[PDB]
Design a protein around this ligand. Structure first.
Ligand code: NI
Length: 275
């Protein structure tokens, strides 16, 4: 069973899903206009059966309330602050973190705020300085939606299909439609303005293991660019690509994605640590 509960935080009321796994904790952070519900394959599958998988909803997303203060909360660094507060409330200082897309950018911002993080895996996330956005992301019509406040019904469907990929389910529309659109506009503006830490430098200098796993056919991430990003400690020494998967390989190719995730968790939590 999945343990659903809600936390009162300084950002608002944050919905949290937890698997019943007794093993080391894994925080999974969803993407723009998604929710932790998207991680059903991990929560309910072999990953969540072994490890304590924690999948919250960002403020303005899913079953969480809108942010008490959108100006504070709706930014990569503001979300990192919220997730850090969530983990402190849960009493967990040393989670492995998996971040999907926006969630990966949030994970990068969490490195400074959550120093006992045992590793970070990013999927759908090119670490980029603000001036590198065109290099890290592919141009297209669904990309413009990332920072667009108001979604038409058609926008909801287009965004859901491109970002979540195969298979499409009606329930995805409900998640995307709920999202506080102010969060899209503000986060995107602040990202381009460099209001938080330079993500290129952060990942270059970070000493914890960082794993990079992407679908080969995602419409958003420039994989070549990602394969050239400098990481302080790149897990298994390369960026990884899953064939026949798009932006969301954790749902499009769960077995192959879970192989990477499980191995990364094992590596970050069950090997003898030496500096
Ligand atoms: Ni979706």
């Amino acid at each position: 069973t999945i343990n659903y509960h809600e936390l009162e935080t300084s950002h608002g009321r944050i919905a949290v899903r937890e698997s019943e796994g007794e093993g080391a904790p894994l925080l999974m952070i969803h993407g723009n206009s998604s929710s932790g519900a998207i991680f059903a394959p991990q929560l309910e599958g072999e990953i969540g059966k072994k490890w304590r998988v924690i999948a919250p909803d960002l403020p303005g997303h899913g079953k969480s309330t809108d942010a008490i203060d959108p100006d504070r909360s709706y930014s990569m660094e503001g979300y990192a602050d919220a997730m850090t507060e969530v983990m402190q409330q849960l009493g967990i200082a040393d989670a492995v973190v998996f971040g999907w897309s926006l969630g990966g950018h949030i994970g990068i911002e969490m490195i400074a705020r959550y120093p006992e993080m045992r590793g970070l895996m990013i999927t759908g996330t090119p670490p980029v300085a603000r001036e590198e956005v065109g290099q890290g992301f592919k141009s297209g019509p669904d990309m413009a939606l990332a920072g667009q406040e108001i979604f038409s019904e058609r926008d909801v469907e287009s965004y859901a299909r491109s970002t979540c990929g195969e298979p499409f389910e009606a329930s995805l529309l409900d998640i995307v439609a709920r999202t506080d659109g102010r969060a899209r506009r503000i986060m995107f503006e602040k990202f381009g303005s460099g209001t938080g830490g330079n993500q290129r430098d952060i990942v270059a200098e970070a000493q914890l293991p960082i794993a990079v796993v992407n679908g080969r056919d995602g419409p958003f991430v420039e994989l070549d660019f990602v394969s050239k990003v400098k990481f302080g400690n790149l897990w298994e020494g390369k960026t990884h690509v899953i064939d026949n998967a798009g932006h969301a390989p954790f749902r499009e190719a769960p077995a192959e994605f879970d192989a990477y995730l499980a191995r990364f968790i094992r590596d970050c939590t069950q090997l003898e640590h030496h500096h």
